[PDB]
Design a binder for this molecule. Structure first.
Ligand SMILES: [Mg+2]
Ligand SMILES: [Mg+2]
Ligand SMILES: [Mg+2]
Ligand SMILES: [Mg+2]
Ligand SMILES: [Mg+2]
Ligand SMILES: [Mg+2]
Ligand SMILES: [Mg+2]
Ligand SMILES: [Mg+2]
Ligand SMILES: [Mg+2]
Lengths: 150, 117, 51
RNA sequence: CUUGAGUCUCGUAGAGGGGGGUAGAAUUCCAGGUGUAGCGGUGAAAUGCGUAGAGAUCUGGAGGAAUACCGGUGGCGAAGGCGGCCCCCUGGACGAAGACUGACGCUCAGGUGCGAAAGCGUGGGGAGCAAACAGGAUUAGAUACCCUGGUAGUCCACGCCGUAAACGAUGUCGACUUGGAGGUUGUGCCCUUGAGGCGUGGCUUCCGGAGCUAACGCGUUAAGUCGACCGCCUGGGGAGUACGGCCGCAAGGUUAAAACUCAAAUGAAUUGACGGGGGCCCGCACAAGCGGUGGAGCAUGUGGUUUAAUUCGAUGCAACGCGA
């Protein structure tokens, strides 16, 4: 509310030492099953790396590039008028949102096992195909079309 | 289609809508464009941006008229009143003389009551 | 108001505009007159100007 | 007799009054040029206006009403009220030195006259706004607020009507009673060497002491301290109603009760509570996320319905896996 936290630091990727890639596992991590979860993260991560040819963390951020939101609208109820005043998103938030979308969309990609879902849906983003890249652009459309408020 | 090399830019920045009409110094409408007639309606068409996106569309006509530079004729409040300019001024159109033709009666007509909520 | 600048640097100088006309003499007349509000409401400004 | 009142001379400022002109800014309308698909309006809209070419834009013209800026704590007036500029006719207020009349004064029931706006008559005028009215939207409804139009009227001349929170809610005339700050206009004086400074009249805001006041507040412009004269008040409702008189074209005004009925009505101030009042804050309250409920099967509680009985109690958040 009026407090002033700092940052809940996380274990830098339990296999790549990358804090960023780490939280990615937390998002997919459900029911405290940090083990069963991460087991699905790396599989599809290494699989896509092997398929794309380049390392995991590489195609990772690459495909993430097309899932990174630069700006987004925010609700402001000022006088019965709920204007969706748009405003660019900070760095940490940009990538954060991306990872969340990727997983969310992957979980319901409809494949057989999460491995394929995550991996496959992870590639679609790299070339702007899956909902991941869609949501980003769909959100950017909210703004601009609302930039009048901006 | 006649190459006038230059004219004037009129802006009717009303409280609900904005329109830009570029015409030769004579006063003969060369090309016009209005905010509302540019997609967005109501609340959205009455925003400052609206005027810009609309104004730029006006040049998309009076430009192929040889026009190089033009003046500015602004009248009335509302947004775009200022925005409209930048659009043209930045749209390559060499500016020159900005004038506010906004009408100002020395007390003559009685404005309507209205507005009471 | 009239405004002409030399050398293309793109500066509105909208000062001379709002430095008098524009709103006020406009926003004031935008809606029905006052008739009564001036000899009172308008003359209540000193009630704030005095201090 | 001259200090009250008034007369004269000389200046002083002024939206004071009646009449006649007159300028520019904008609005609407008409005509045409240019130009093309919108404009207008709202919280959204919609009615409405646009291809029979609107809107925008330019040119010419028609007309009515009102005078941005100056402009204010401003000025004038008995009150109402009175703003562009020009002239004509005209009233009052103020200072200055004095010259003059010589108490010629103050107040005033009745009476007389002036009276915002709306309204009424006759005849003009009519751009904008706008009761009525007509659509459109809002809503449960919405004979309203909002939108699109729009008649009376608003403007004018002469006559009528006399009311207003006609308010400073504070009658007029005169005299005394500490101060401070500022506006307005007149007048005397100062190396005026300056707008500068000092005084001294009329008017006018603001703060305020004494005192007055129920308090709020008023306070040398009093609601302080006194005097002359007048108007009005005597509980609230009924009621500024009826009746009658008078006035009026009328709308209506004015004068003005009774029955009946209640133990209050009322002023101010206080404390708290509340506000679709304001300012500043806090709570997983919101926002930020994750997972849930509401759909499904079953458990369970509750209302209901049934029953011979469905024992009793808890039933906004603070009842419903609650007393059990
Ligand atoms: Mg109306
Ligand atoms: Mg009248
Ligand atoms: Mg009449
Ligand atoms: Mg006076
Ligand atoms: Mg005082
Ligand atoms: Mg009270
Ligand atoms: Mg907490
Ligand atoms: Mg929430
Ligand atoms: Mg959910």
């Amino acid at each position: 509310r009026r407090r002033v936290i700092g940052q809940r630091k996380i274990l830098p990727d339990p296999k790549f030492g990358s804090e960023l890639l780490a939280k990615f596992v937390n998002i997919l991590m459900v029911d405290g099953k940090k083990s069963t979860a991460e087991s699905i993260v790396y599989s599809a991560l290494e699989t896509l790396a092997q398929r794309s040819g380049k390392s995991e963390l590489e195609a990772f951020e690459v495909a993430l590039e097309n899932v990174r939101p630069t700006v987004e609208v925010k609700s402001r109820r000022v006088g019965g008028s709920t204007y969706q005043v748009p405003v660019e998103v900070r760095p940490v938030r940009r990538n954060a949102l991306a990872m969340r979308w990727i997983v969310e969309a992957a979980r319901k990609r409809g494949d057989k096992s999460m491995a394929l879902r995550l991996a496959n849906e992870l590639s679609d983003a790299a070339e702007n195909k899956g909902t991941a890249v869609k949501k980003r652009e769909d959100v950017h459309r909210m703004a601009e079309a609302n930039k009048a408020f901006a | 289609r006649k190459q006038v090399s230059d004219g004037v830019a009129h802006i009717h920045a009303s409280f609900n809508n904005t329109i830009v009409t570029i015409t030769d110094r004579q006063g003969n409408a060369l090309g016009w464009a209005t905010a509302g007639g540019s997609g967005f309606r109501g609340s959205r068409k009455s925003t400052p941006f609206a005027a810009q996106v609309a104004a730029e569309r006006c040049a998309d006509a009076v430009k192929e008229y040889g026009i190089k530079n033009l003046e500015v004729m602004v009248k009335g409040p509302g947004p775009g009143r200022e925005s409209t300019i930048r659009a043209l001024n930045a749209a390559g159109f060499r500016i020159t003389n900005i004038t506010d033709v906004t009408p100002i009666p020395h007390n003559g007509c009685r404005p309507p009551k209205k507005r009471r909520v | 108001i009239k405004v002409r600048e030399n050398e293309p640097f793109d500066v509105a100088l909208r000062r001379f505009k709002r430095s008098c006309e524009k709103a006020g003499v406009l926003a004031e007349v935008r809606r029905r007159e006052f008739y009564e509000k001036p000899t009172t409401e308008r003359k209540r400004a000193k009630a704030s100007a005095v201090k």
